[PDB]
Amino acid sequence: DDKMDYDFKVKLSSERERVEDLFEYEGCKVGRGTYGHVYKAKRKDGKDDKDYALKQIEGTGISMSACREIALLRELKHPNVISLQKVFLSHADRKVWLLFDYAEHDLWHIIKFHRASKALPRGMVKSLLYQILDGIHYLHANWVLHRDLKPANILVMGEGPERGRVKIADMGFARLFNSPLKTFWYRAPELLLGARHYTKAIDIWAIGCIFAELLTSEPIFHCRQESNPYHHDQLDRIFNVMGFPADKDWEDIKKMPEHSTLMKDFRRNTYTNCSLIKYMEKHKVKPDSKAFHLLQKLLTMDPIKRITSEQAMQDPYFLEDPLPTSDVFAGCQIPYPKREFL
Amino acid sequence: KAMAGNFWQSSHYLQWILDKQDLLKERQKDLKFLSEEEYWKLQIFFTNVIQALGEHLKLRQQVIATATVYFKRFYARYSLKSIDPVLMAPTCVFLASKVEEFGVVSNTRLIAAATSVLKTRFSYAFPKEFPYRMNHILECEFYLLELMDCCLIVYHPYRPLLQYVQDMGQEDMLLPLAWRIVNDTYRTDLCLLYPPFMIALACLHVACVVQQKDARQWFAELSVDMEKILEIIRVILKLYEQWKNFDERKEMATILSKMPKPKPPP
Numbered sequence: 001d002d003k004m005d006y007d008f009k010v011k012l013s014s015e016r017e018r019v020e021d022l023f024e025y026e027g028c029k030v031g032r033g034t035y036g037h038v039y040k041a042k043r044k045d046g047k048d049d050k051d052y053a054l055k056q057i058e059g060t061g062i063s064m065s066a067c068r069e070i071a072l073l074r075e076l077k078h079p080n081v082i083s084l085q086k087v088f089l090s091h092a093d094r095k096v097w098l099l100f101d102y103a104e105h106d107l108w109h110i111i112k113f114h115r116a117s118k119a120l121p122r123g124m125v126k127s128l129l130y131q132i133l134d135g136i137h138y139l140h141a142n143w144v145l146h147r148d149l150k151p152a153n154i155l156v157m158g159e160g161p162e163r164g165r166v167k168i169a170d171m172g173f174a175r176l177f178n179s180p181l182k183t184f185w186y187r188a189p190e191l192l193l194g195a196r197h198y199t200k201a202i203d204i205w206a207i208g209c210i211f212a213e214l215l216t217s218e219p220i221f222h223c224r225q226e227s228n229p230y231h232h233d234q235l236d237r238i239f240n241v242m243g244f245p246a247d248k249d250w251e252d253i254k255k256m257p258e259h260s261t262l263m264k265d266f267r268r269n270t271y272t273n274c275s276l277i278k279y280m281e282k283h284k285v286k287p288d289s290k291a292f293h294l295l296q297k298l299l300t301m302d303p304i305k306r307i308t309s310e311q312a313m314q315d316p317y318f319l320e321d322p323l324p325t326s327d328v329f330a331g332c333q334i335p336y337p338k339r340e341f342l
Numbered sequence: 343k344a345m346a347g348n349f350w351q352s353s354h355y356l357q358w359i360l361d362k363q364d365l366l367k368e369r370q371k372d373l374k375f376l377s378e379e380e381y382w383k384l385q386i387f388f389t390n391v392i393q394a395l396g397e398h399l400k401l402r403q404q405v406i407a408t409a410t411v412y413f414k415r416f417y418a419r420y421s422l423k424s425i426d427p428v429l430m431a432p433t434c435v436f437l438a439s440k441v442e443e444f445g446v447v448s449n450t451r452l453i454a455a456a457t458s459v460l461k462t463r464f465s466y467a468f469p470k471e472f473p474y475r476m477n478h479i480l481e482c483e484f485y486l487l488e489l490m491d492c493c494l495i496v497y498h499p500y501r502p503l504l505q506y507v508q509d510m511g512q513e514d515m516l517l518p519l520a521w522r523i524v525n526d527t528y529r530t531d532l533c534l535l536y537p538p539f540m541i542a543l544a545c546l547h548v549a550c551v552v553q554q555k556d557a558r559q560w561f562a563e564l565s566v567d568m569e570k571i572l573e574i575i576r577v578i579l580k581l582y583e584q585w586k587n588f589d590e591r592k593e594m595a596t597i598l599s600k601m602p603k604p605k606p607p608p
């Protein structure tokens with residue numbers, strides 16, 4: 001700028017750390033999506049040989065979603081939430097880069113490995129669940145909702161000082177007026193019936209879905225693909241697993257914007273032999289297990305009757321043998337492949 | 343309510359509660375051009391400019407307050423000549439508005455707001471029209487975020503003040519004045535030097551005195567360093583005496599002319 005002081009400008013330009021000078025990342029892309037571009041990176045000087053994740057934020061400048069992600073990550077500190085190490089602001093192209101510690105694994109790949117094996121885990125499942133609840137409880141206590149919880153966003157650290165530690169990532173930081181309206185497998189039924197705002201209870205439903213999938217290796221509410229919140233086939237799958245809710249189970253279902261549509265399309269009789277008990281029996285989980293009774297409390301249809309993250313953390317399941325461990329792999333060797341480059 | 347109970351481990355507390363002597367030491371470079379009185383008068387002027395900009399755009403007081411802190415942080419570290427405060431004021435409002443998710447300020451609206459507010463409310467200071475365009479705002483925003491070390495979440499006295507007056511059972515009587523006095527504290531350095539709950543308690547004390555409300559027992563029932571509250575009370579009392587003696591409409595054009603100017607390029 002002409003009206004900016006020149007000495008001030010050149011001093012800052014001389015001192016400013018550029019992402020391309022500090023890190024080696026070309027050809028090392030490991031992710032690509034609506035979030036942006038994620039790279040596996042090494043430090044160019046030989047101070048430490050650790051792996052780092054570099055996220056180039058989607059778009060240019062500082063959008064409302066970019067502003068809020070920086071704002072909140074700058075404050076949040078907890079072992080089970082991914083930690084922002086540094087921000088690079090690239091003046092030439094107006095791009096924003098975020099530096100995090102590198103997580104070798106995630107629940108999407110871990111679950112796919114077990115699902116692929118067609119031809120430790122019980123201690124691992126509990127420990128994963130406990131750390132996901134701990135992480136989300138920390139965000140919730142700070143009035144920060146995730147708003148997009150699923151196995152792809154539950155990272156797990158590989159070999160290093162934080163071996164087998166869960167890291168929650170890719171929080172939905174920007175949603176206009178906190179609104180859902182502006183593959184549906186992890187979405188709470190109230191969202192599908194047109195709920196106008198995200199809640200803590202919506203995150204908890206997603207954790208219930210993740211927990212079912214960890215126990216069975218299959219997405220509990222799996223459904224075919226395909227603006228409006230109402231999605232017929234996703235609701236049908238929910239009722240096929242859960243049963244259709246009685247008036248007493250969800251009294252305020254009448255207040256949901258899409259309730260009359262539900263009544264128009266669905267009949268109670270269709271799901272009269274469907275229940276979570278029967279579904280989980282077919283996938284070798286016992287209904288009198290402490291694991292199951294907790295799952296049912298997490299997967300409660302009416303959001304006000306859904307258990308909170310803190311109450312789920314106090315569940316006797318986590319006092320039953322085996323106890324949860326800081327390393328979810330529990331000292332055992334990691335059989336899961338390292339993630340490949342793009 | 344994001345991060346509402348996290349002040350003691352916040353970047354506000356850990357990085358941006360400053361030492362008064364370090365603040366004064368960095369101020370000496372601009373004090374070669376302006377007196378101490380003239381520098382305080384400039385701070386008042388640009389607080390009013392940011393207030394007017396936020397009111398024009400219909401932003402809630404907390405967003406306006408956050409934009410004012412951003413401005414103060416920048417010039418706490420750097421000279422007034424480094425970036426034009428006329429450019430920096432709307433940039434701080436724009437950035438602060440994007441930390442929220444309930445509504446968006448578009449580019450044309452920002453530029454229209456800066457142009458209109460300066461001509462209709464500050465023509466005594468600025469004879470020419472707002473000479474900057476959106477590309478200058480976007481560039482200034484990058485410098486601002488860098489300087490602030492990406493620290494965007496800011497705590498203010500409004501939330502604690504609200505809890506205190508509800509605790510007293512004196513919301514209807516005391517809140518409107520206490521809230522107004524909190525607004526006036528942004529004309530000073532207080533937000534850089536004390537935690538927000540202490541500023542709120544000082545503003546509520548001055549409100550009780552103006553309205554002749556006996557609250558000495560209530561203030562005794564608290565567990566707080568009352569010496570630091572008294573320090574804050576005295577800066578508020580002095581603020582209103584400088585207000586009385588200051589005519590910004592008559593003085594600011596001359597004070598703005600004395601500001602150090604930027605060095606041009608080679």
Ligand SMILES: Cc1cccc(Cc2n[nH]c3cc(O)c(C(=O)N4CC[C@H](O)C4)cc23)c1
Binds near residue numbers: 100
């Ligand atoms: C593609 C990919 C998937 C899983 C993990 C890694 C590697 C990694 N390590 N540390 C990270 C921090 C991060 O914020 C993100 C990140 O931005 N994500 C967006 C989608 C997912 O939620 C991970 C990734 C990593 C790469």
